[PDB]
């Protein structure tokens, strides 16, 4: 029922070659974003979702579109390469869902961090406070398990939803070969 | 409950150019489109932009073919910073002047029913010339009294044309003054349009060609001087009325000599001054 413009930040880095998480982390994350996009569309028919990659620098593949077929189709040919630039990717996503189609919609970022983040704590907390001022929620998935912990991510999310904001999230998934869609249950339902 | 005669419709430069270009493109047809703007006060109907729409028709009528385009265009302009909504429609009358026909009145009736103060603008491309553009804004009169109230002289300054009066002006519809308020950047860009590159100003002109042109004009002036001598001997054996028709179908040596003198003086003075200026500027 709630209007939400949610931009997905997918990680097509070189650590996605790893087969630890089911048939390659790339395919696991493909299924995960499939379920997340379907969940958003089912939650609201007018809800619009987009796609951004976190490759060498960044790349926007599909801006906010109510349909999901184009997003899924573009998801193919997302072959991994390069490192991950979390700060730049999130800033680009922030700009993209600042230039919304409908200003009454809410603003959200679902990020799939399946690789270490090389951004210091200070820059990440600065980004956290800026996004809190701009009223953005960041659902972060600690995919990949390259650190599978508060790899400078729990600080990010807690800074976001500080003072009982309960807006952001950080779902950490173990390397257990279980479908990432099967694992995700917090943001989809109890958002 | 007044609708005053001092009301004006402010047409932006962009809107005017778009209207004229589309109308001229559709020279035999009455190509048409929508006008976006705001209803500021009861004395202003600001037109800030216009966009043509997919339409098809013959030389006797034109109709739009899809409304989905209009809706989508409004949305996709709002998304980029033009939240203004439709305030009227424009269509071109190629050579018939400016006025509304029966179909035009029906369309304007629909627009009025939607929004009270919607206006119709008729732009005639072919009758427009460089200095002046033939354009007018209209609105309808109900089946009633006077259509408007006059609290100033602003309305009665246009002298409505005979063609519009014949076709129904002041009887089925009334005109609204068009004003062309501009912003600083629009003014500056319009002035800068015709500005040329700086190097073009200092660039000289092939001396062979310059000398050839001078020689040609002096040779022409020789024959013109012969004819001028012949003509001066006349003007005494000429009736006061016959002089005027004397220069009909026959060359005027005095006029041609003056024109050639002007052109020669301008060219030579400009060339000499440019040569000296370059001589100093470039070492």
């Amino acid at each position: 029922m709630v209007l939400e413009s949610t931009m997905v930040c997918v990680d097509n880095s070189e650590y996605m070659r790893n087969g630890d998480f089911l048939p390659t982390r790339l395919q696991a994350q493909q299924d995960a974003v499939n379920i997340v996009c379907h969940s958003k569309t089912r939650s609201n028919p007018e809800n619009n979702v987009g796609l951004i990659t976190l490759a060498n620098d960044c790349e926007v593949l599909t801006t906010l579109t109510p349909d999901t077929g184009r997003i899924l189709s573009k998801l193919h040919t997302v072959q991994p390469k390069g490192k991950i630039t979390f700060c730049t990717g999130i800033r680009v996503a922030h700009l993209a869902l600042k230039h919304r189609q409908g200003k009454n919609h809410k603003m959200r970022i679902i990020a799939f961090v399946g690789s270490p983040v090389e951004d210091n704590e200070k820059d990440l907390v600065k980004l956290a406070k800026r996004l809190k001022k701009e009223k953005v929620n960041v659902d972060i998935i600690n995919f990949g398990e390259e650190e599978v912990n508060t790899e400078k991510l729990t600080a990010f999310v807690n800074t976001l939803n500080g003072k009982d904001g309960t807006g952001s999230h950080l779902v950490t998934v173990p390397p257990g070969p279980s479908l990432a869609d099967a694992l995700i249950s917090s943001p989809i339902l109890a958002g | 409950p007044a609708v005053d005669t001092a009301e004006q419709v402010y047409i932006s430069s962009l809107a005017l150019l778009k209207m004229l270009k589309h109308g001229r493109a559709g020279v035999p047809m009455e190509v048409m489109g929508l006008m976006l703007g705001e209803f500021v006060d009861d004395y202003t109907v600001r037109v800030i932009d216009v966009f043509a729409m997919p339409q098809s028709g013959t030389g006797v009528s034109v109709e739009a073919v899809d409304p989905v385009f209009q809706a989508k265009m409004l949305d996709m302009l709002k998304q980029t910073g033009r939240p203004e909504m439709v305030v009227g429609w424009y269509h071109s009358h190629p050579g018939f002047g400016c006025w509304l026909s029966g179909v035009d009145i029906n369309t304007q009736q629909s627009f009025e029913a939607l929004s009270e103060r919607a206006v119709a603008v008729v732009v005639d491309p072919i009758q427009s010339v460089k200095g002046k553009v033939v354009i007018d804004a209209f609105r309808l009169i109900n089946a009633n009294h006077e259509p408007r109230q006059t609290t100033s002289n602003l309305g009665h300054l246009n002298k409505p044309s005979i063609q519009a009066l014949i076709h129904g002006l002041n009887r089925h519809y009334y005109s609204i003054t068009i004003n062309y308020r501009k912003n600083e950047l629009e003014q500056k860009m319009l002035l800068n349009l015709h500005k040329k590159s700086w190097m073009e100003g200092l660039t000289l002109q092939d001396y062979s060609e310059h000398c050839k042109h001078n020689e040609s004009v002096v040779k022409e002036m020789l024959e013109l001087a012969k004819n001028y001598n012949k003509a001066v001997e006349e003007e005494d054996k000429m009736t006061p009325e016959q002089l005027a028709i004397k220069n009909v179908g026959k060359q005027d040596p005095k006029r041609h000599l003056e024109e050639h003198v002007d052109v020669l003086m301008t060219s030579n003075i400009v060339q000499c001054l440019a040569a000296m200026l370059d001589t100093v500027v470039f070492k």
Binding site: - | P1, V40, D41, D42, Y43, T44, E146, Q149, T150, T151
Partner: protein, 332 residues
Amino acid sequence: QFRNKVLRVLVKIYMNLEKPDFINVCQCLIFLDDPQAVSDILEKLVKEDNLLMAYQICFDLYESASQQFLSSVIQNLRTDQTLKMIKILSGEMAIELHLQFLIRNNNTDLMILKNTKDAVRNSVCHTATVIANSFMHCGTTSDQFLRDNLEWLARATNWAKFTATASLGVIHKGHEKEALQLMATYLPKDTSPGSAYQEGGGLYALGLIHANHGGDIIDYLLNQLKNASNDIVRHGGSLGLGLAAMGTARQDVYDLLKTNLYQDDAVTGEAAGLALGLVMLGSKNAQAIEDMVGYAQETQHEKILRGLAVGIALVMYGRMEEADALIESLCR
């Protein structure tokens, strides 16, 4: 500067005479803008038995001197004859005398107005003939034409009604003895309620009656404008208040008119700009010029622009070469 020096020398020569020409000296003093000297001369005359000199001089001052000049001469004097003299400079006596003269000598042919009314065939000519009647009877206190042609006047609607109501104030020019009740009778309360045009016209008419000479009317119109709700009422009140306070740089009036202007409404804005000009007339107030020019360059209402265009010129009245900068900027 040289003219002022020569006028001072002439004043000295006038003083040094057996029977000094105090009238011409006061004229030259008005030119020099030195109310101190005129106050001193009036004090000396009262100290002598030259009440006739004092009265004639004060009459001439009121008739051909600025309000600021008159006010200073009324403040210098203050800090039975003095009360009588001040009542001359305050202008009450002159206004009453002119009103009596115009009432008594009121030869006007109503046949011409009747012919115009019969020939009238549209709203423009209707309002034109109403204005012409107001001009003909300005100061005569007479409204026989309006009284007898009541059913013909009802045709006017909207701003025509506004002008028709203001014509009453035009007719009653200077009839300040009882203006509040005089206008209330014409604009009855709880009688055909809901005529914002009529109410605004009434405020405008009070202003026109008390033009250039305010007093309690300034405060009355200030309160009415503050309590006003309709834009027509605000426009009429702004015009009336400007006329009432014309020439007195009263900060309360200026601030109220500025708030009405910044309300950003065309009908209110035109009158607000004109009233600001009238209020801060003559004065070179940098604050007023800055505010008015800035709003002229910031607003998007040609009506407000027109009002402010008149207002700025009114503001810079009199100042000959102190207006060069503003003139150049506005022309550019």
